[PDB]
Amino acid sequence: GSMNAPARAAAKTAADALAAAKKTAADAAAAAAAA
């Protein structure tokens, strides 16, 4: 039974990788206006 805050901290890197991936994806897409 681990649905608490400290239990969610283990999934940090997972959501962290996605945060970077999502940022960069849109980042590159945003700079695709002059293409």
mmCIF file of all heavy atoms in Angstrom:
data_model
loop_
_atom_site.group_PDB
_atom_site.id
_atom_site.type_symbol
_atom_site.label_atom_id
_atom_site.label_comp_id
_atom_site.label_asym_id
_atom_site.label_seq_id
_atom_site.Cartn_x
_atom_site.Cartn_y
_atom_site.Cartn_z
ATOM 1 N N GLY A 1 0.828 -1.228 0.000
ATOM 2 C CA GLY A 1 0.000 0.000 0.000
ATOM 3 C C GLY A 1 0.845 1.254 0.000
ATOM 4 O O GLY A 1 1.053 1.871 1.045
ATOM 5 N N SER A 2 1.327 1.640 -1.170
ATOM 6 C CA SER A 2 2.203 2.793 -1.291
ATOM 7 C C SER A 2 1.691 3.751 -2.360
ATOM 8 O O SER A 2 2.080 3.668 -3.525
ATOM 9 C CB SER A 2 3.626 2.341 -1.623
ATOM 10 O OG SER A 2 3.682 0.942 -1.859
ATOM 11 N N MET A 3 0.808 4.649 -1.960
ATOM 12 C CA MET A 3 0.276 5.653 -2.871
ATOM 13 C C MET A 3 0.508 7.043 -2.295
ATOM 14 O O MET A 3 -0.098 8.026 -2.726
ATOM 15 C CB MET A 3 -1.217 5.418 -3.111
ATOM 16 C CG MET A 3 -1.551 5.016 -4.539
ATOM 17 S SD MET A 3 -1.912 6.438 -5.589
ATOM 18 C CE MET A 3 -3.695 6.322 -5.709
ATOM 19 N N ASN A 4 1.403 7.106 -1.323
ATOM 20 C CA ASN A 4 1.685 8.339 -0.601
ATOM 21 C C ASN A 4 2.697 9.196 -1.350
ATOM 22 O O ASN A 4 3.181 8.816 -2.420
ATOM 23 C CB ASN A 4 2.220 8.024 0.803
ATOM 24 C CG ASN A 4 1.620 6.766 1.406
ATOM 25 O OD1 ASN A 4 1.905 5.651 0.964
ATOM 26 N ND2 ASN A 4 0.788 6.936 2.417
ATOM 27 N N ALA A 5 3.026 10.343 -0.767
ATOM 28 C CA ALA A 5 3.971 11.283 -1.364
ATOM 29 C C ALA A 5 5.370 10.682 -1.552
ATOM 30 O O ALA A 5 5.922 10.752 -2.650
ATOM 31 C CB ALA A 5 4.042 12.562 -0.538
ATOM 32 N N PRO A 6 5.975 10.074 -0.504
ATOM 33 C CA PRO A 6 7.326 9.505 -0.609
ATOM 34 C C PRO A 6 7.376 8.337 -1.583
ATOM 35 O O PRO A 6 8.422 8.027 -2.153
ATOM 36 C CB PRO A 6 7.638 9.036 0.816
ATOM 37 C CG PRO A 6 6.314 8.861 1.466
ATOM 38 C CD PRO A 6 5.420 9.897 0.851
ATOM 39 N N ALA A 7 6.231 7.704 -1.779
ATOM 40 C CA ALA A 7 6.126 6.587 -2.706
ATOM 41 C C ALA A 7 6.151 7.083 -4.142
ATOM 42 O O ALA A 7 6.608 6.390 -5.050
ATOM 43 C CB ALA A 7 4.861 5.788 -2.437
ATOM 44 N N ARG A 8 5.685 8.304 -4.320
ATOM 45 C CA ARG A 8 5.608 8.923 -5.633
ATOM 46 C C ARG A 8 6.957 9.510 -6.025
ATOM 47 O O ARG A 8 7.227 9.736 -7.203
ATOM 48 C CB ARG A 8 4.536 10.015 -5.637
ATOM 49 C CG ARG A 8 3.227 9.580 -6.275
ATOM 50 C CD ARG A 8 2.124 10.591 -6.022
ATOM 51 N NE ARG A 8 1.041 10.033 -5.214
ATOM 52 C CZ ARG A 8 -0.217 10.477 -5.247
ATOM 53 N NH1 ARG A 8 -0.546 11.502 -6.025
ATOM 54 N NH2 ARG A 8 -1.137 9.901 -4.489
ATOM 55 N N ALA A 9 7.808 9.734 -5.031
ATOM 56 C CA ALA A 9 9.123 10.324 -5.258
ATOM 57 C C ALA A 9 10.045 9.371 -6.017
ATOM 58 O O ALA A 9 11.053 9.792 -6.587
ATOM 59 C CB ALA A 9 9.751 10.720 -3.934
ATOM 60 N N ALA A 10 9.696 8.092 -6.023
ATOM 61 C CA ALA A 10 10.489 7.084 -6.718
ATOM 62 C C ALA A 10 10.281 7.169 -8.229
ATOM 63 O O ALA A 10 11.118 6.724 -9.010
ATOM 64 C CB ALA A 10 10.140 5.693 -6.209
ATOM 65 N N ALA A 11 9.170 7.769 -8.633
ATOM 66 C CA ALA A 11 8.829 7.884 -10.047
ATOM 67 C C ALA A 11 9.333 9.204 -10.624
ATOM 68 O O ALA A 11 8.970 9.585 -11.740
ATOM 69 C CB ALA A 11 7.324 7.759 -10.235
ATOM 70 N N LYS A 12 10.169 9.891 -9.849
ATOM 71 C CA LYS A 12 10.705 11.195 -10.234
ATOM 72 C C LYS A 12 11.378 11.143 -11.604
ATOM 73 O O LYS A 12 10.924 11.785 -12.543
ATOM 74 C CB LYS A 12 11.702 11.684 -9.181
ATOM 75 C CG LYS A 12 12.185 13.112 -9.398
ATOM 76 C CD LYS A 12 13.685 13.156 -9.617
ATOM 77 C CE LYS A 12 14.233 14.562 -9.450
ATOM 78 N NZ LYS A 12 15.038 14.982 -10.624
ATOM 79 N N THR A 13 12.464 10.378 -11.699
ATOM 80 C CA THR A 13 13.232 10.238 -12.933
ATOM 81 C C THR A 13 12.364 9.901 -14.149
ATOM 82 O O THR A 13 12.646 10.344 -15.259
ATOM 83 C CB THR A 13 14.297 9.147 -12.759
ATOM 84 O OG1 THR A 13 14.419 8.819 -11.370
ATOM 85 C CG2 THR A 13 15.638 9.608 -13.302
ATOM 86 N N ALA A 14 11.307 9.130 -13.932
ATOM 87 C CA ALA A 14 10.412 8.748 -15.015
ATOM 88 C C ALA A 14 9.707 9.975 -15.586
ATOM 89 O O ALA A 14 9.780 10.243 -16.784
ATOM 90 C CB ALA A 14 9.398 7.721 -14.531
ATOM 91 N N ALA A 15 9.037 10.721 -14.713
ATOM 92 C CA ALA A 15 8.361 11.951 -15.109
ATOM 93 C C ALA A 15 9.369 13.035 -15.486
ATOM 94 O O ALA A 15 9.054 13.956 -16.242
ATOM 95 C CB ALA A 15 7.454 12.435 -13.988
ATOM 96 N N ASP A 16 10.585 12.910 -14.967
ATOM 97 C CA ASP A 16 11.646 13.871 -15.234
ATOM 98 C C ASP A 16 12.123 13.747 -16.675
ATOM 99 O O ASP A 16 12.304 14.746 -17.375
ATOM 100 C CB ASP A 16 12.826 13.645 -14.288
ATOM 101 C CG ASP A 16 13.565 14.930 -13.961
ATOM 102 O OD1 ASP A 16 14.171 15.523 -14.880
ATOM 103 O OD2 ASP A 16 13.552 15.350 -12.785
ATOM 104 N N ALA A 17 12.320 12.508 -17.110
ATOM 105 C CA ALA A 17 12.746 12.231 -18.474
ATOM 106 C C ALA A 17 11.696 12.716 -19.465
ATOM 107 O O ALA A 17 12.018 13.286 -20.509
ATOM 108 C CB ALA A 17 12.998 10.743 -18.653
ATOM 109 N N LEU A 18 10.432 12.501 -19.115
ATOM 110 C CA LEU A 18 9.323 12.921 -19.959
ATOM 111 C C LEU A 18 9.253 14.440 -20.034
ATOM 112 O O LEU A 18 9.015 15.002 -21.100
ATOM 113 C CB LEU A 18 8.006 12.369 -19.421
ATOM 114 C CG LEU A 18 7.846 10.853 -19.533
ATOM 115 C CD1 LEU A 18 6.472 10.440 -19.044
ATOM 116 C CD2 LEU A 18 8.062 10.390 -20.968
ATOM 117 N N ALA A 19 9.463 15.092 -18.896
ATOM 118 C CA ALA A 19 9.472 16.548 -18.830
ATOM 119 C C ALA A 19 10.484 17.135 -19.809
ATOM 120 O O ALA A 19 10.180 18.080 -20.537
ATOM 121 C CB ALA A 19 9.773 17.015 -17.412
ATOM 122 N N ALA A 20 11.682 16.563 -19.827
ATOM 123 C CA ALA A 20 12.730 17.008 -20.737
ATOM 124 C C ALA A 20 12.364 16.693 -22.186
ATOM 125 O O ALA A 20 12.494 17.542 -23.072
ATOM 126 C CB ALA A 20 14.057 16.356 -20.373
ATOM 127 N N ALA A 21 11.889 15.473 -22.414
ATOM 128 C CA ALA A 21 11.517 15.025 -23.751
ATOM 129 C C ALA A 21 10.399 15.882 -24.333
ATOM 130 O O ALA A 21 10.460 16.290 -25.494
ATOM 131 C CB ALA A 21 11.099 13.562 -23.720
ATOM 132 N N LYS A 22 9.394 16.171 -23.515
ATOM 133 C CA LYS A 22 8.247 16.958 -23.952
ATOM 134 C C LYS A 22 8.661 18.399 -24.228
ATOM 135 O O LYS A 22 8.213 19.014 -25.198
ATOM 136 C CB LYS A 22 7.153 16.929 -22.881
ATOM 137 C CG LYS A 22 6.044 15.920 -23.144
ATOM 138 C CD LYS A 22 6.585 14.602 -23.679
ATOM 139 C CE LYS A 22 5.464 13.668 -24.103
ATOM 140 N NZ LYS A 22 4.685 14.211 -25.244
ATOM 141 N N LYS A 23 9.527 18.924 -23.368
ATOM 142 C CA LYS A 23 10.019 20.285 -23.503
ATOM 143 C C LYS A 23 10.762 20.439 -24.811
ATOM 144 O O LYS A 23 10.425 21.286 -25.632
ATOM 145 C CB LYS A 23 10.951 20.632 -22.341
ATOM 146 C CG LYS A 23 11.692 21.954 -22.513
ATOM 147 C CD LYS A 23 10.742 23.143 -22.543
ATOM 148 C CE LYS A 23 11.496 24.449 -22.754
ATOM 149 N NZ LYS A 23 10.846 25.308 -23.782
ATOM 150 N N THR A 24 11.761 19.600 -24.991
ATOM 151 C CA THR A 24 12.614 19.648 -26.146
ATOM 152 C C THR A 24 11.839 19.405 -27.447
ATOM 153 O O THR A 24 12.095 20.065 -28.455
ATOM 154 C CB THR A 24 13.730 18.614 -25.980
ATOM 155 O OG1 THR A 24 14.726 19.116 -25.080
ATOM 156 C CG2 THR A 24 14.354 18.269 -27.307
ATOM 157 N N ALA A 25 10.888 18.472 -27.418
ATOM 158 C CA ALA A 25 10.079 18.178 -28.597
ATOM 159 C C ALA A 25 9.340 19.427 -29.066
ATOM 160 O O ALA A 25 9.425 19.815 -30.234
ATOM 161 C CB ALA A 25 9.093 17.055 -28.303
ATOM 162 N N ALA A 26 8.629 20.056 -28.136
ATOM 163 C CA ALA A 26 7.905 21.289 -28.430
ATOM 164 C C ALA A 26 8.869 22.433 -28.723
ATOM 165 O O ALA A 26 8.583 23.303 -29.540
ATOM 166 C CB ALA A 26 6.988 21.655 -27.276
ATOM 167 N N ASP A 27 10.012 22.413 -28.050
ATOM 168 C CA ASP A 27 11.062 23.406 -28.264
ATOM 169 C C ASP A 27 11.513 23.405 -29.720
ATOM 170 O O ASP A 27 11.570 24.449 -30.367
ATOM 171 C CB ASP A 27 12.256 23.105 -27.355
ATOM 172 C CG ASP A 27 12.846 24.346 -26.718
ATOM 173 O OD1 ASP A 27 12.081 25.141 -26.131
ATOM 174 O OD2 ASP A 27 14.082 24.518 -26.781
ATOM 175 N N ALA A 28 11.817 22.219 -30.229
ATOM 176 C CA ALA A 28 12.229 22.056 -31.616
ATOM 177 C C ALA A 28 11.086 22.380 -32.574
ATOM 178 O O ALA A 28 11.304 22.950 -33.643
ATOM 179 C CB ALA A 28 12.733 20.641 -31.850
ATOM 180 N N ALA A 29 9.868 22.030 -32.176
ATOM 181 C CA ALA A 29 8.689 22.277 -32.997
ATOM 182 C C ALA A 29 8.391 23.771 -33.076
ATOM 183 O O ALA A 29 7.962 24.280 -34.110
ATOM 184 C CB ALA A 29 7.490 21.526 -32.441
ATOM 185 N N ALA A 30 8.630 24.470 -31.972
ATOM 186 C CA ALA A 30 8.440 25.911 -31.915
ATOM 187 C C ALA A 30 9.405 26.616 -32.857
ATOM 188 O O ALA A 30 9.052 27.598 -33.509
ATOM 189 C CB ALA A 30 8.630 26.411 -30.494
ATOM 190 N N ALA A 31 10.621 26.087 -32.939
ATOM 191 C CA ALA A 31 11.648 26.647 -33.808
ATOM 192 C C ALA A 31 11.522 26.105 -35.229
ATOM 193 O O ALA A 31 12.438 26.233 -36.042
ATOM 194 C CB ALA A 31 13.034 26.350 -33.248
ATOM 195 N N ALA A 32 10.397 25.468 -35.515
ATOM 196 C CA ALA A 32 10.116 24.974 -36.855
ATOM 197 C C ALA A 32 9.137 25.894 -37.575
ATOM 198 O O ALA A 32 8.345 25.446 -38.403
ATOM 199 C CB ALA A 32 9.576 23.553 -36.800
ATOM 200 N N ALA A 33 9.196 27.174 -37.249
ATOM 201 C CA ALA A 33 8.300 28.157 -37.846
ATOM 202 C C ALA A 33 8.913 28.722 -39.116
ATOM 203 O O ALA A 33 8.208 29.078 -40.061
ATOM 204 C CB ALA A 33 7.995 29.274 -36.860
ATOM 205 N N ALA A 34 10.232 28.808 -39.125
ATOM 206 C CA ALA A 34 10.964 29.235 -40.305
ATOM 207 C C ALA A 34 11.597 28.031 -40.993
ATOM 208 O O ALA A 34 12.823 27.926 -41.100
ATOM 209 C CB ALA A 34 12.023 30.265 -39.937
ATOM 210 N N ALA A 35 10.750 27.117 -41.444
ATOM 211 C CA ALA A 35 11.203 25.904 -42.107
ATOM 212 C C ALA A 35 10.325 25.607 -43.312
ATOM 213 O O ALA A 35 10.841 25.077 -44.316
ATOM 214 C CB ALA A 35 11.183 24.733 -41.135
#
